[PDB]
Curated annotation (Swiss-Prot), chain A:
This is 26S proteasome regulatory subunit 8. Coiled coil: none annotated. Belongs to the AAA ATPase family. It is found in: Cytoplasm; Nucleus. It comes from Homo sapiens. Component of the 26S proteasome, a multiprotein complex involved in the ATP-dependent degradation of ubiquitinated proteins. This complex plays a key role in the maintenance of protein homeostasis by removing misfolded or damaged proteins, which could impair cellular functions, and by removing proteins whose functions are no longer required. Therefore, the proteasome participates in numerous cellular processes, including cell cycle progression, apoptosis, or DNA damage repair. Component of the 19S proteasome regulatory particle complex. The 26S proteasome consists of a 20S core particle (CP) and two 19S regulatory subunits (RP). The regulatory particle is made of a lid composed of 9 subunits, a base containing 6 ATPases including PSMC5 and few additional components. Component of a complex with USP49 and RUVBL1. Interacts with PRPF19. Interacts with TRIM5. Interacts with NDC80. Interacts with PAAF1. Interacts, in vitro, with the thyroid hormone receptor (in a thyroid hormone T3-dependent manner) and with retinoid X receptor (RXR). Interacts with ERCC6.
From Swiss-Prot, chain B:
Component of the 26S proteasome, a multiprotein complex involved in the ATP-dependent degradation of ubiquitinated proteins. This complex plays a key role in the maintenance of protein homeostasis by removing misfolded or damaged proteins, which could impair cellular functions, and by removing proteins whose functions are no longer required. Therefore, the proteasome participates in numerous cellular processes, including cell cycle progression, apoptosis, or DNA damage repair. The chain holds residues 39 to 70 of 418 of the full protein. The gene is PSMC4. It comes from the Eukaryota. Component of the 19S proteasome regulatory particle complex. The 26S proteasome consists of a 20S core particle (CP) and two 19S regulatory subunits (RP). The regulatory particle is made of a lid composed of 9 subunits, a base containing 6 ATPases including PSMC4 and few additional components. Interacts with NR1I3. Interacts with PAAF1. Interacts with TRIM5. Interacts with ZFAND1. It is found in: Cytoplasm; Nucleus. This is 26S proteasome regulatory subunit 6B. Belongs to the AAA ATPase family.
UniProtKB/Swiss-Prot annotation, chain D:
Does not bind a metal ion. It comes from Homo sapiens. This is 26S proteasome non-ATPase regulatory subunit 7. PROSITE patterns: MPN. It holds the Pfam family JAB. One of its GO terms (cellular component) is ficolin-1-rich granule lumen. Belongs to the peptidase M67A family. There is a cross-link at residue 176 (Glycyl lysine isopeptide (Lys-Gly) (interchain with G-Cter in ubiquitin)).
From Swiss-Prot, chain E:
It comes from Homo sapiens (Human). The gene is PSMD13. This is 26S proteasome non-ATPase regulatory subunit 13. Component of the 19S proteasome regulatory particle complex. The 26S proteasome consists of a 20S core particle (CP) and two 19S regulatory subunits (RP). The regulatory particle is made of a lid composed of 9 subunits including PSMD13, a base containing 6 ATPases and few additional components. The modification N6-acetyllysine is found at residue 16. Belongs to the proteasome subunit S11 family. Component of the 26S proteasome, a multiprotein complex involved in the ATP-dependent degradation of ubiquitinated proteins. This complex plays a key role in the maintenance of protein homeostasis by removing misfolded or damaged proteins, which could impair cellular functions, and by removing proteins whose functions are no longer required. Therefore, the proteasome participates in numerous cellular processes, including cell cycle progression, apoptosis, or DNA damage repair. The chain holds residues 283 to 376 of 376 of the full protein. Signal peptide: none annotated.
């Protein structure tokens, strides 16, 4: 576990953290596109 | 499932990263 | 024998001949012939456009002597090549781009001589610098008012480019004629030079405007930008709890914080950066 | 003197169609036509153009043809349809001007007293400003030329009119463009600028390597007129010019430092105005 | 002779190479300025005669040889310093 | 590699650990270079296992492309002499592998067990059994056509009805929905009659006998009416019957196109002949397609350029590419620009890198048709490929480019490359369903329709619910086709929106004030959603993970109903049955 699982379990941490991170970054960019698309359509 | 969890979160990185590059092209295009 | 989904090819020289003759004869209909080739039974291609001497009224316009007509086409054959008339055009200034009762009368004249004679409508008044209102129509019989007129084997001339406008179907569509689609064919040679005609030499890229007026312009803009900041302190602090659509109705008037404040910063940025950066290169590059 | 011409964008396109008429021969067939303009001012205008038949050989460049009869009748038509317009000169499509190109001017100076040419380029391999125009004078030299007759460079620009800006910029929609983008054109302009600088230096050393050794006439043209170009060459980093960059650039740095100091505060308003609207719409929903 | 580096020449080398005395070099150089083959200026607190403009003269083979060496040394520096602008900003200027 | 062999052959149990390891090394594998190095040893140990597994050693091999190694173990089964275990090695080979691969392996098979190569590589006993399944199972309705009968006018509707019953009666040979009348069928003219004799063969799909004998009226030299489209479009339907089966049907169509009329018969003949010789690289069909191409004619444009790619499927014969793209620069018509635009996309198929010089060469070009043609090519060079390299610039030019045609072809390339995981495509196209132009709003709808169509997707129907409300007519159209493809053979329990939409097509077809183009999707979806009496379905996919390449061709060619109506008559390639079938002897 400390030699054969911990190499993966500590590594999937930061792979979870960046997906956790940029989802906040994505939905910021999502709503900004919806502002301009509702502005151009109108 | 433990090797699959490590591979699938890698696949959820660049497939999610290309969406970040995508809105940069969208918001630049909508200003024109 | 049947129609199809037709397509009107153009030349890029034609559309500029269309509107400039139209704009210079604005308060009346100005007339001209249209000169091209019947490339197949499906599409049509105009390459040339020329006018003729005319005589008009406020409500009508007429051509004059046809000795101009054949002698014009004769001297276009020997320089270049021979070609073919395909139709004609005129203007409807400020109108709803629709075939008038005299405009339809010259079309049984033209459809009996050659089959797919195209009537083309231009308006240089409802056309803005963004886009042009060009239009082309094709007469249909009234004897086939019950029988079908197009076989409709595709979608390209049915729901595309618009549904027909309410001020044009009030006379026309789909009675007495049918509309037709227009695109833009482009040769590579003119396409490359239509791209680059708004650029300059390296003289314009390497100017340093003048440092007296540049400092004077910076002295100017910052000075009222102080006064914009005077008004900005009052309004942001003010904020009467008014459910801000009522903030958004008491601001139409003279009210303008936050709007000039973003504006003048953009002007002070792009002026100062380019004035510095061009002065940077004139020392690194030169000597 | 004329000191510039003003070319509308209806021509530069009514030339290229005529290059596209006879362009099936492919190899070489120069287009020559007739230019139409306005007897305006010292400054001059160009409005319209039309063509004329012309052929010429490869050797013995003295066999060439301008149909005068075609030039009389077709201009007689354009005089008939347009009384405002009259002739101002001519054009040819050749990328570099040829040796033949002076007798063509010497023909049609009997039509307009100052008959002006315009060279255009159907293929600007140079990405810079095409379609430059010349005029002929006499500059009789110390050498003993009976008539030193060579064309002079005249600056030029693309004209504009309210109707033609509609039709042209409608056709610009086939490609994308940033005319509205501030400082995005500007950074390209020094890139398009210094590309022009490097292009003129690679051309001038190709002339200078030939005239140095082996073969070229070494004549009292450019070789000292280009020596005067070296004479200017400012000595930029010297005694008192240092006090021109450290007394004036730091002036323009403060204005940028002012502009950032407000732009950060403006973007800080949008935080609190969003953070109030975020949680207070939340705490009343729950 | 000197390539415009310290071309503010003092009176002594004029008075030596023209072998005229010291108190006549000013009347000598004001003549050449009045005719117009030179466009310099005259100091007297140091008695240095600054040079700005020389008329262009005829030259020969080896003057062209150094002039290409001036031109190549100037041409390849412009191109290198223009790369440093584009290399600094690749996808920033579109 | 060798420690990976040590893991499977050590103190480690095998319930299924040698099964999902094949799945992980096939699904999430980076490249072909580390794939085949892993995959080729994993079935050598299966041959080294005491019981040799048979479906997986065939499954890997068609991924590995060994046209001799399956014949080697077939020889061992000839040596073992039992066709029971020599069966699933062979019909999984017929179901999954390519036509050229079976045309290449047959040399190693011929060099009972003598009858075996006929039984497994002709695949005839699957054809008439599929015909046996349709002649026995047929659960349709006459009343649905009678409900749509009441739109008698001079509009599309005659073509719209005959395209409906042709789709819902594929391969069942049942002419009672058409033989109820003659005059309403023979009302519309001059291209519907080209489609009316076209729809006759789709009903007789996959059947040798009733092709010449029923169309004996419709041979062009027997009746000779004033209509040549009625008699010239039969050869179109002959190719529809014998798709992926080449016999006299090649040469019966070959010798008639030597001497014929103008391109009113040569549309039906060339499209049929390229269909029967699809992916076969025959020189004899390439010869008369040369002289059909160089007619300098508009009406031969769909004739040559489509079938010129069909016979060269996945071939990348670079001189033929150079001949095609070198031809489509100087011609002055548009169908000759259009038919070659799909054909040069179809000449390259599943290459992952081997088109990228050409893809950049087409996208940079000034031609909007040819840039659009590069978008279909990168869609076909990455079939099912989850490569994030291709999605950079395929989807960049979906943003920036100015023609509407290329933008619709850009976003419809997404389901063609990402159907392997249908979970992700509703997450990326849902933002594109609200775009400012209707063209991207259209191609958003077909992208969900081509990806999740095999599944009853809960998320996609949630996205396509407000899409049928838009004031543009054709985006209301393509919402209905995508709503048809998403829920075929699904009854009320996979998703409750089935009968919520059955009434919705009848809601919009019985109205008078609707558009023609708006209700054209509804009449089309009636033939889709009840296809073959709920017996056939779409399948771009096998259980082996390998894609079904005629259905991939069939659904891509189906997208071009905008530019030719009976071009999307090529849809019978997508229809596949879902029926378990038992068998104990040869017969």
């Amino acid at each position: 576990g400390s030699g054969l699982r911990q190499y993966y379990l500590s590594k999937i941490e930061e792979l979870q953290l960046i997906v956790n991170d940029k989802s906040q970054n994505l939905r910021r960019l999502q709503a900004q596109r919806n502002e301009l698309n509702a502005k151009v359509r109108l | 499932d433990l090797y699959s969890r490590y591979k699938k979160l890698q696949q959820e990185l660049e497939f999610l990263e290309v969406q970040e590059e995508y809105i940069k092209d969208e918001q630049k295009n909508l200003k024109k | 024998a049947v129609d199809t989904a037709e397509q009107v090819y153009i030349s890029s020289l034609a559309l500029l001949k269309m509107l400039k003759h139209g704009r210079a004869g604005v308060p009346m209909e100005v007339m001209g012939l249209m000169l091209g080739e019947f490339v197949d039974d499906y599409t049509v291609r105009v390459i040339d456009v020329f006018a003729m001497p005319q005589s008009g009224t406020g409500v009508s316009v007429e051509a004059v002597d046809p000795v101009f007509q054949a002698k014009m086409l004769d001297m276009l054959k020997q320089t270049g090549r021979p070609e073919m008339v395909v139709g004609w055009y005129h203007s409807h200034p400020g109108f709803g781009c629709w075939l008038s009762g005299v405009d339809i009368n010259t079309q049984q004249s033209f459809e009996a001589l050659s089959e797919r004679a195209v009537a083309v409508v231009v308006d240089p008044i409802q056309s803005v610098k963004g886009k042009v209102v060009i239009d082309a129509f094709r007469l249909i019989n009234a004897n086939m008012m019950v029988l079908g007129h197009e076989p409709r084997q595709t979608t390209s001339n049915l729901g595309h480019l618009n549904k027909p406008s309410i001020q044009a179907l009030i006379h026309g569509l789909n009675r007495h004629y049918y509309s037709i689609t227009i695109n833009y064919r482009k040769n590579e040679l003119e396409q490359k030079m239509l791209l680059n005609l708004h650029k300059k030499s390296w003289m314009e890229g390497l100017t340093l405007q003048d440092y007296s007026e540049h400092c004077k312009h910076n002295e100017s803009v910052v000075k009222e930008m102080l006064e914009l900041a005077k008004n900005y302190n009052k309004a942001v602090e003010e904020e009467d709890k008014m459910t801000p659509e009522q903030l958004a109705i008491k601001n139409v008037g003279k009210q303008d914080p936050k709007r000039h404040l973003e504006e003048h910063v953009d002007v002070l940025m792009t002026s100062n950066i380019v004035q510095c950066l061009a002065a940077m290169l004139d020392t690194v590059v030169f000597k | 003197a004329v000191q510039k011409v003003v070319v509308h964008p209806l021509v530069l396109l009514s030339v290229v169609d005529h290059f596209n008429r006879i362009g099936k021969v492919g190899n070489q067939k120069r287009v020559v036509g007739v230019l139409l303009g306005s007897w305006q001012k010292k400054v001059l205008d160009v409005s319209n153009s039309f063509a004329v038949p012309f052929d010429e050989d490869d050797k013995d460049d003295s066999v060439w043809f301008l149909d005068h009869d075609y030039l009389e009748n077709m201009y007689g038509m354009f005089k008939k349809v347009n009384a405002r317009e009259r002739i101002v000169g001519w054009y040819h499509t050749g990328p570099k001007l040829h040796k033949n190109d002076i007798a063509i001017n010497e023909l049609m100076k009997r039509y307009c007293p100052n008959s002006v040419l315009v060279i255009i380029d159907v293929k600007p391999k140079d990405l810079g400003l095409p379609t430059e125009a010349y005029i002929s004078v006499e500059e009789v030299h110390d050498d003993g030329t009976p008539t030193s007759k060579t064309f002079e460079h005249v600056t030029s620009e693309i004209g504009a009119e309210e109707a033609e800006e509609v039709g042209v910029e409608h056709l610009l929609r086939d490609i994308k463009d940033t005319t509205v983008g501030t400082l995005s054109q500007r950074i390209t302009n020094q890139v398009h600028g210094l590309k022009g600088l490097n292009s003129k230096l690679l051309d001038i050393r190709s002339y200078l390597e030939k005239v140095a050794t082996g073969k070229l006439p070494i004549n009292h043209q450019i070789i000292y007129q280009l020596q005067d170009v070296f004479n200017l060459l400012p000595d930029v980093s010297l005694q008192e010019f240092v006090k021109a960059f450290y007394l004036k650039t730091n002036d323009q740095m403060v204005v940028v430092y002012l502009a950032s100091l407000i732009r950060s505060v403006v973007a800080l308003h949008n935080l609190i105005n969003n953070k109030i609207a975020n949680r207070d719409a939340e705490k009343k929903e729950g | 002779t000197r390539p415009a580096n310290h071309r503010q020449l003092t009176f002594e080398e004029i008075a030596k190479s023209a072998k005229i005395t010291v108190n006549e070099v000013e009347l000598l150089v004001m003549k050449a300025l009045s005719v117009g083959l030179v466009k310099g200026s005259i100091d007297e607190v140091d008695k240095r005669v600054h040079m700005t403009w020389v008329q262009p003269r005829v030259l020969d083979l080896q003057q062209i040889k150094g002039m290409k060496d001036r031109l190549e040394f100037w041409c390849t520096d412009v191109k290198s310093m223009e790369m440093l602008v584009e290399h600094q900003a690749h996808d920033i200027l579109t | 590699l060798d420690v990976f062999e040590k893991t499977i052959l050590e103190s480690n149990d095998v319930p299924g650990m040698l099964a999902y390891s094949l799945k992980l090394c096939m699904s999430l594998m980076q490249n072909k270079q580390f794939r085949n190095k892993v995959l080729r040893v994993l079935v050598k140990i299966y041959m080294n296992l005491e019981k040799p597994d048979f479906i997986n050693v065939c499954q890997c091999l068609i991924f590995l492309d060994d046209p001799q190694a399956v014949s080697d173990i077939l020889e061992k089964l000839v040596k073992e002499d039992n066709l029971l275990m020599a069966y699933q090695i062979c019909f999984d080979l017929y179901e999954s592998a390519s036509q050229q691969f079976l045309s290449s392996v047959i040399q190693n098979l011929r060099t009972d067990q003598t009858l075996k190569m006929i039984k497994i590589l002709s695949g005839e006993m699957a054809i008439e059994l599929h015909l046996q399944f349709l002649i026995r199972n047929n659960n349709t309705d006459l009343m649905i056509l009678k409900n749509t009968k009441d739109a008698v006018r001079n509009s599309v509707c005659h073509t719209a009805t005959v395209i409906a019953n042709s789709f819902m009666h594929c391969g069942t040979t049942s002419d009672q929905f058409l033989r109820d009348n003659l005059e309403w069928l023979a009302r519309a003219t001059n291209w519907a009659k080209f489609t009316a004799t076209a729809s006759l063969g789709v009903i007789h799909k996959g059947h040798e006998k009733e092709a010449l004998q029923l169309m004996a009226t419709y041979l062009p030299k027997d009746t000779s009416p004033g209509s040549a489209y009625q008699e010239g479009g039969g050869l179109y339907a002959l190719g529809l019957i014998h798709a992926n089966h080449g016999g006299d049907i090649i040469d019966y169509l070959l010798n008639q196109l030597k001497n014929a009329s103008n391109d009113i018969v040569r549309h039906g003949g060339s499209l049929g002949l390229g269909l029967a010789a699809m992916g076969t690289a025959r020189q004899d069909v390439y010869d008369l397609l040369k002289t059909n191409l160089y007619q300098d004619d508009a009406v031969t444009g769909e004739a040559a350029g489509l079938a010129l790619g069909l016979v060269m499927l996945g071939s990348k014969n670079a001189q033929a590419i150079e001949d095609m793209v070198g031809y489509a620069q100087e011609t002055q018509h548009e169908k000759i620009l259009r038919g070659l635009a799909v054909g040069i996309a179809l000449v390259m198929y599943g290459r992952m890198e081997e088109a990228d010089a050409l893809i950049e060469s087409l996208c940079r070009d000034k031609d909007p048709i040819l840039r659009r043609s590069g978008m279909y090519t990168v869609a076909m060079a990455y079939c099912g490929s989850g490569n994030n390299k291709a999605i950079r610039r395929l989807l960049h030019v979906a943003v920036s480019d100015v023609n509407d045609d290329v933008r619709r072809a850009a976003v419809e390339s997404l389901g063609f490359i990402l159907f392997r995981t249908p979970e992700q495509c509703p997450s990326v196209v849902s933002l594109l369903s609200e775009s400012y132009n209707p063209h991207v709003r259209y191609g958003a709808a077909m992208a969900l329709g081509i990806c999740c169509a095999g599944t009853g997707n809960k998320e996609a129907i949630n996205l396509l619910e407000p899409m049928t409300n838009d004031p543009v007519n054709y985006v209301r159209q393509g919402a209905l086709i995508a709503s048809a493809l998403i829920m075929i053979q699904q009854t009320e329990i996979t998703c409750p929106k089935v009968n919520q939409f059955r009434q919705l097509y009848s809601k919009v077809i019985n109205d008078k004030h609707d558009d023609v183009m708006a209700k054209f999707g509804a009449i089309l979806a009636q033939g889709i959603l009840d296809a073959g009496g709920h017996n056939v379905t779409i399948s771009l996919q096998s259980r082996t993970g390998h894609t079904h390449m005629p259905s991939v061709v069939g659904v891509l060619v189906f997208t071009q109903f905008w530019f030719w109506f009976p071009l999307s008559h090529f849809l019978s390639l997508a229809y596949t049955p879902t029926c378990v079938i038992g068998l104990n002897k040869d017969l």
